[PDB]
Structure formats: C-alpha cells, structure tokens
Amino acid sequence: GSHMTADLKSLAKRIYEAYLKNFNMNKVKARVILSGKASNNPPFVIHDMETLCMAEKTLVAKLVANGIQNKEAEVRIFHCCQCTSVETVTELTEFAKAIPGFANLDLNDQVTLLKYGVYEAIFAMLSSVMNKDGMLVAYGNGFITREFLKSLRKPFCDIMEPKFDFAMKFNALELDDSDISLFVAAIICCGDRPGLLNVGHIEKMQEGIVHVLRLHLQSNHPDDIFLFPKLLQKMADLRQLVTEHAQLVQIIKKTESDAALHPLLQEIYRDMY
Numbered sequence: 001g002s003h004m005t006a007d008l009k010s011l012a013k014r015i016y017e018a019y020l021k022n023f024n025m026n027k028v029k030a031r032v033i034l035s036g037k038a039s040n041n042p043p044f045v046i047h048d049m050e051t052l053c054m055a056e057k058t059l060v061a062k063l064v065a066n067g068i069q070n071k072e073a074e075v076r077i078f079h080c081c082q083c084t085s086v087e088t089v090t091e092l093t094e095f096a097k098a099i100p101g102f103a104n105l106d107l108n109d110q111v112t113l114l115k116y117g118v119y120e121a122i123f124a125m126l127s128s129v130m131n132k133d134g135m136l137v138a139y140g141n142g143f144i145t146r147e148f149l150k151s152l153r154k155p156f157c158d159i160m161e162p163k164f165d166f167a168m169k170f171n172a173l174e175l176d177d178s179d180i181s182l183f184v185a186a187i188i189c190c191g192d193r194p195g196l197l198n199v200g201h202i203e204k205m206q207e208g209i210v211h212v213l214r215l216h217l218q219s220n221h222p223d224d225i226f227l228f229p230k231l232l233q234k235m236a237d238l239r240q241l242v243t244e245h246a247q248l249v250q251i252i253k254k255t256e257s258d259a260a261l262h263p264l265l266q267e268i269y270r271d272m273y
C-alpha cells in the first residue's frame with residue numbers, strides 16, 4: 001500500500017541501525033567535521049605534495065609494511081584509498097546480512113550482488129564525506145583537496161573528479177543517514193546483476209526494500225515530492241559511474257607497472273564490466 005505498517009517501519013529501523021553499526025563514518029559525523037562548529041581543531045589538510053609527505057610521516061609504519069613508502073606519490077595516495085575501499089567492502093558485507101532475505105540467498109548470488117553493488121554503495125556513501133573543496137580521509141582526521149587530486153599526473157587526476165561531480169548533485173538532495181541506509185540496501189539488492197541465479201527471489205527481496213525506501217522518503221522528505229524517482233535515477237548514474245571507474249582501473253592497471261591492484265579488489269573488478 002501507501003502507508004507504513006509496523007513491519008515496514010521496523011524494517012527501516014533495522015536497516016538504519018545496521019548502517020550506523022557497520023560504517024564508522026556516517027553523514028551526521030562527517031558534516032559536523034566539515035562544518036567546524038563542534039571543534040576548532042580541523043582535519044589536517046592535504047593540498048599539495050609537501051602536506052602529503054607531512055601526512056605520510058604519520059603513516060610511515062603502514063607504508064613501510066606494505067612496501068609503498070618509495071612508490072610514486074600518486075601510487076601512495078591510491079594505495080591508501082584502496083585500503084579504505086577494502087574496509088568499506090568488509091563493512092558492506094556485514095551490513096548486507098541485515099537485509100531481510102540476503103543471507104538466505106545462494107552463496108553465489110550473495111557474492112554476485114556484493115561484487116557489483118559495493119562500489120555503487122561506496123561512491124554513494126563517499127558523498128557524505130565530500131564537499132565542493134575536498135574529501136575527508138583517515139576516519140575524518142584528514143582532508144584532501146579536490147584541486148590537489150586534479151593536480152596529480154594523468155591518469156591519476158581523472159579518478160576522483162567524477163566522484164566529486166556525482167557527490168555534489170547527490171548531496172543537493174539533502175538525504176540523512178536513515179535515507180542513505182535504505183538507498184544502500186536497495187543498491188545491494190539489484191536483481192539485474194550479471195550472472196544472478198535466482199533472479200525471481202532477488203527481485204522480491206529488492207521490491208520489499210524499494211517499497212520501504214519510497215514510503216520512508218515520502219514521510220521523511222514530504223516536500224520533495226519526486227525524491228524517490230530522483231534516487232532511482234541516481235542509482236542508474238551510480239551504475240554508469242562504476243562501469244567507467246572499473247574501465248579506468250583496468251587501463252591504469254595495465255599501463256602503470258608500479259601500481260598494484262589490491263588482491264581483494266582484484267577479484268571484485270575481475271570480469272565485472
């Protein structure tokens with residue numbers, strides 16, 4: 001129907017609580033850091049090569065242990081960014097268990113849904129820690145400027161800017177964590193992924209989440225009448241954004257002998273698009 005019964009309201013709260021439990025950086029926390037109203041101690045700003053190398057003095061143990069300290073600056077940056085993606089994949093994998101029906105799926109279908117869904121979710125949630133000038137890193141303790149990322153040498157300067165472009169329009173929708181949690185659940189449940197076995201079952205799982213998403217958006221943002229259709233379009237945009245990101249990763253991986261794709265991320269991108 002069009003009214004939120006108790007089972008739907010409970011489902012929405014369960015997804016929201018799993019989102020808060022599994023993702024350390026939520027939008028409320030990110031925006032207070034980015035706003036600077038709860039503290040006069042801002043994140044360390046990485047805006048050029050000098051401040052990058054300053055920040056990396058704190059990270060020396062991790063860079064040394066990973067054999068990255070002497071790699072080119074661009075490679076060092078996106079090695080750390082890869083490690084962050086790996087953490088978020090792990091968190092999304094645990095989050096998906098809270099989606100009613102997900103754990104009941106064939107294990108191969110769970111793997112397929114997460115394979116194609118995680119980076120759409122990652123770039124959706126990445127918007128929460130982005131403003132027009134840069135993005136929070138290191139659990140909100142650092143802030144790497146958008147211009148410094150564009151200043152990197154090709155093709156590394158082409159990686160993050162499309163994600164900033166998406167985030168600025170996504171953030172204009174003014175979603176809160178309760179919306180984003182259901183949006184991320186809907187992303188994970190897409191029944192259109194390549195190689196899914198039990199499509200019918202997955203589509204019924206997806207329909208339940210998307211129904212709760214619509215009713216929740218209508219209740220939580222009553223003045224933005226078509227916010228739900230707007231978000232359906234954002235899901236399509238994310239699929240295109242990830243398709244292009246994966247293609248660019250393949251190009252870079254093949255023409256950059258000293259940059260290494262993280263093993264876990266290797267399997268994700270393997271035969272993706």
Ligand SMILES: CC(C)(Oc1ccc([C@@H]2CC2(Cl)Cl)cc1)C(=O)O
Binds near residue numbers: 055084
């Ligand atoms: C603190 C650490 C290593 O996370 C990081 C560290 C560095 C970065 C990137 C390079 C800048 Cl600083 Cl732009 C992102 C996440 C961690 O996960 O423990």
Ligand SMILES: CC(C)(Oc1ccc([C@@H]2CC2(Cl)Cl)cc1)C(=O)O
Binds near residue numbers: 250256
């Ligand atoms: C957002 C992020 C970090 O993008 C990248 C960017 C660069 C790389 C590294 C250099 C090769 Cl291409 Cl080996 C892998 C992934 C990701 O996909 O997790």
